[PDB]
């Protein structure tokens, strides 16, 4: 019955440790991810500088390939291991079949790794949940998410971590088909999501984009200040 | 030193007709300049619709025969149905490549019916390729038997000779004549003839003797 161990079912038909492992993901930092028509964009919140150190090591958004990007929630160490494995897998695929790695393949890899990692003997399942964003086939934007169970599940927009119910609940009554991207609208959608964050402190927003042909662009918190100002301008025009 | 192989020789014929696959073979098993026996039939009845012949190195012939019988029983006892002819052909090709780097010194010819009820002769090689042909001769008497079949079965190199389908009794008397004519000039042929006929009604056999030297 009881929450130990991973192997044994519940008396009413559940796996506890998979269900308990998602609470770690829900009890972590928040990060959203959207795809426009041609630009894909995501970003983590809660930069949370402590005034006595650098933050260039604590980066939660990285890349495995020149077509794909990372993002996660939950605890950080599992994310470190999963990313360091995923890079090696991406290069090993590149050593085979000479294509750029399709995002579907690397998500199947990560989910399969985590899955056979879950079924095994007394091993602690990874308390993370990734966002895997890439545009490969003719520049078609894709973004998939994981689960501690290991079920990849393709979305068009996403919200994980703390408050993610409300953070995703904003996305229905903002996300239109119209239009299109229109990269500025995609950016403003990211800005509306960051202003829609649980805190939206103003300076703790760190977002990074990809225009489906370039490499990752790390933004600058003066452009984001103009973004917050023009969001406030539109909010005042609503009155 | 130790040699792994010895040439035992032998002769295997096969003719795919319209609805019949006749496979015949002599029963002389020899070595060097000796005779070990005058009865060792190269034909083996696998199913009611598949007969295999195996010549060459005799021990590998025995081993291969028994392995094929084992996998036949495995497929049947797993999947409630007998194999086809081409299924057995593909399986034999997989096996012969599965011992690529220590080859069987064995020629192989499978006759039998297809799923249409027509003859199908699958030839082989010692390494494991195959093809669906109309007639093949395997063994030392291959060169003594292929061109005559080209003259009669293939009707090749002739003028104004129409094409009659190969009937049964015509094929039977052809097999008897090619084995007499090949046994006259070859040293690895004689003393019997084991003719196997695969119809839509089972497997018949027939024994025709030869000259005793």
């Amino acid at each position: 019955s009881y929450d130990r161990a991973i192997t044994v079912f519940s008396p009413d038909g559940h796996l506890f440790q998979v269900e308990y492992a998602q609470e770690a993901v829900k009890k972590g930092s928040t990060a959203v991810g959207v795809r426009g028509r041609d630009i894909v964009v995501l970003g983590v919140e809660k930069k949370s500088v402590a005034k006595l150190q650098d933050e260039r090591t604590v980066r939660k958004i990285c890349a495995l390939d020149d077509n794909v990007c990372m993002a996660f929630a939950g605890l950080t160490a599992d994310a470190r291991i999963v990313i360091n494995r995923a890079r090696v897998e991406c290069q090993s695929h590149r050593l085979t079949v000479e294509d750029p790695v399709t995002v579907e393949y690397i998500t199947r890899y990560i989910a399969s790794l985590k899955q056979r990692y879950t079924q095994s003997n007394g091993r602690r399942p990874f308390g993370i949940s990734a966002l895997i964003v890439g545009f490969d086939f003719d520049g078609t934007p894709r973004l998939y998410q994981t689960d501690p169970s290991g079920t990849y599940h393709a979305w068009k927009a996403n919200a994980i971590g703390r408050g993610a119910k409300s953070v995703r609940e904003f996305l229905e009554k903002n996300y239109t088909d119209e239009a299109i991207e229109t990269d500025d609208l995609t950016i403003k959608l990211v800005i509306k999501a960051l202003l829609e964050v649980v805190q939206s402190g103003g300076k703790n927003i760190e977002l990074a984009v990809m225009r489906r042909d370039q490499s990752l662009k790390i933004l600058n918190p003066e452009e984001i200040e103009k973004y917050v100002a023009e969001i406030e301008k539109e909010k005042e025009e609503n009155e | 030193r130790f040699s792994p192989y010895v040439f035992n020789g032998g002769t295997i014929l096969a003719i795919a007709g319209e609805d019949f696959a006749i496979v015949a073979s002599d029963t002389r098993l020899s070595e060097g300049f000796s005779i070990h026996t005058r009865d060792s039939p190269k034909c083996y009845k696998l199913t009611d619709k598949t007969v295999i012949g195996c010549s060459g190195f005799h021990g590998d012939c025995l081993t291969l025969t028994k392995i094929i019988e084992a996998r036949l029983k495995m497929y049947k006892h797993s999947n409630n149905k007998a194999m086809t002819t081409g299924a057995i052909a593909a399986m034999l090709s997989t096996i012969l490549y599965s011992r690529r780097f220590f080859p069987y010194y064995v020629y192989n010819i499978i006759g039998g019916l297809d799923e249409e009820g027509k003859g199908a002769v699958y030839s082989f090689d010692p390494v494991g390729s195959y093809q669906r042909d109309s007639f093949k001769a395997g063994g030392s008497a291959s060169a003594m038997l292929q061109p005559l079949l080209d003259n009669q079965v293939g009707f090749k190199n002739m003028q104004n000779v129409e094409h009659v389908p190969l009937s049964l009794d015509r094929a039977m008397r052809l097999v008897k004549d090619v084995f007499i004519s090949a046994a006259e000039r070859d040293v690895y042929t004689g003393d019997a003839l084991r003719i196997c006929i695969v119809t839509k009604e089972g497997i018949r056999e027939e024994t025709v003797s030869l000259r005793k030297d």
Binding site: - | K66, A70, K73, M74, H77
Partner: protein, 238 residues
């Protein structure tokens, strides 16, 4: 009651209860009856279904040209011992180029099932084997048990409510030895029709008959060569 946990533990009365629990796991299979003449061995089982539309779970499974088993209980261990059985049959068929004597095969089954009843990490096999075969000395009807204490009999019946079957086998084991195939098989289903509650009758699609003969290869039957076997019966004496 804490001694009743694992295979390793001896009880303070010496009766390892995992074996008894495996026996009771055998008792919840389908009913099956096996019996031999001097020349022909027949084992007849009963099929069951999950619903009406579904097909019926078969019990007699073929093994070899002269060996056939019945089964009761679990199906996973059934197919596992089937695989091992066929493996040993074809192995001796390959090496010695002979059919197996049955008794040494069943001793191999006992030695196979001995280790999972002795060490830790594997459960005993809930299994209901009724083996029919032909060595040089004729037909044999063996049974196993999950405690690996394989028996030889002349008429056995294991499963659910198999006891009335055993009483019938008791009162006709003298009659069994003389007859030919037809009334032998109908004695077998004259055990099965008392392995059922009396308000429903044995139809075609629920029964399975497997004959092995001294010159006859082992063959399974279902509904179509069983309609010749199901005629020639009277009603139960209501």
């Amino acid at each position: 009651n804490q001694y009743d946990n694992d295979v390793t533990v001896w009880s303070p009365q010496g009766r390892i209860h995992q074996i008894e629990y495996a026996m009771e796991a055998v008792k919840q299979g389908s009913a099956t009856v096996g019996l031999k003449s001097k020349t022909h061995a027949v084992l007849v089982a009963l099929k069951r279904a999950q619903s009406e539309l579904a097909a019926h779970q078969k019990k007699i499974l073929h093994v070899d040209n002269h060996i056939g088993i019945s089964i009761a209980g679990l199906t996973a261990d059934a197919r596992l011992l089937c695989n091992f059985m066929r493996q040993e049959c074809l192995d001796s068929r390959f090496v010695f180029d002979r059919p197996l004597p049955v008794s040494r095969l069943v001793s191999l089954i006992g030695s196979k099932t001995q280790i999972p009843t002795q060490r830790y990490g594997r459960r005993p096999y809930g299994v209901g084997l009724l083996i029919a075969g032909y060595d040089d000395m004729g037909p044999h009807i063996f049974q196993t048990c999950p405690s690996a204490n394989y028996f030889d009999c002349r008429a056995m019946s294991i499963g659910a409510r198999s006891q009335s079957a055993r009483t019938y086998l008791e009162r006709h084991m003298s009659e069994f030895m003389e007859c030919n195939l037809n009334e032998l098989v109908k004695h077998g289903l004259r055990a099965l029709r008392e392995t059922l509650p009396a308000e429903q009758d044995l139809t075609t699609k629920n029964v399975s008959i497997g004959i092995v003969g001294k010159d006859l290869e082992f063959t399974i039957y279902d509904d179509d060569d069983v309609s010749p076997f199901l005629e020639g019966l009277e009603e139960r004496p209501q």
